[PDB]
Amino acid sequence: VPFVEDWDLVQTLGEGEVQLAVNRVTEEAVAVKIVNIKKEICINKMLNHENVVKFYGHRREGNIQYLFLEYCSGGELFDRIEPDIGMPEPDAQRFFHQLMAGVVYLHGIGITHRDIKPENLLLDERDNLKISDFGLATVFRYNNRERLLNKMCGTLPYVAPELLKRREFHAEPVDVWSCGIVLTAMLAGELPWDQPSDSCQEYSDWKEKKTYLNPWKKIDSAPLALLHKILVENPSARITIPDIKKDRWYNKPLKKGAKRPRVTS
């Protein structure tokens, strides 16, 4: 079948750069990443899950690497968050369920993302959350042996406090913490601190349990009981994903399914 391997770059999705590519024959839409990268390709080749951005393949034309990835027409979770407001709680709960399914998957295969934030959480046509960008990702468990991390990476507002205080740390509690910062952004439409350090007034207020202040003031007591268990400074006392799935707000019926077509009489 001629020309089925030809793609047209029709618009920039993000900045290397990510372009929306449309197949000349089929009109199938994919996102093409134009660019460390050797590790990114190898990690993406291991991934196959409904809440992880699909990897179709890669091609190298000289010095330029072309990564063929899933186009998520719903865009970023970031653009669903209304500044200083957030989003309806049943939406945030459904996105948080999906974020956990993805993170459970990655952790089960011994991969840590290390930069979870709403800019990286994409949405497909049915608003299904997909984790993206494996550029900072790494193997923390191999041959059933865990290796402690020491490399400082991520984005300061989403980084766990042990990354700024300790030489070495477990990988899984770091991704749990960032998921708790994402949940805060979804329910309050604002980040609680610039970084999780004692020098940060907002961070000290949280540790002092001053939940009468923002963003905690905008969050209902049931999701806020969950954020109290996630945003725990000691990563050994911090809630794990198996225990998150047992949380009351996490199991609270709130959201109806996607409205199906209906007629009366």
Ligand SMILES: COc1cc2c(cc1OC)-c1n[nH]c(-c3ccc(O)cc3)c1C2
């Ligand atoms: C800013 O808006 C968007 C951004 C983006 C998309 C779609 C958007 O709007 C529909 C999209 N699909 N796949 C990807 C994407 C896929 C893999 C990756 O590593 C990085 C980005 C993006 C970014």
